[PDB]
Ligand binder design. Sequence first.
Ligand SMILES: [Cl-]
Length: 88
Amino acid sequence: ANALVVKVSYGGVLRRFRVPVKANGQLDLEMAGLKEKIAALFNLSADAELSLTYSAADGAVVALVDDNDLFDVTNQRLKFLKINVNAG
Ligand SMILES: [Cl-]
């Protein structure tokens, strides 16, 4: 009953929304719904091949390319996610 805060950066612009979690701690969101939300926020195509990345605590970048990557945001008990969006 505690949501994940997601910040998304695109074009020098930061936007915030919150994503509900299930009792599992699993996000109530999949990659399609994430892309649709980001598309609505920045007037992009929801089916564009967007690079969605975040910087992990070990200094390595994580690319969100499938639902397993999003499942692992919760598995890792992150409470804040900052996603950088790049197009092309
Ligand atoms: Cl902020």
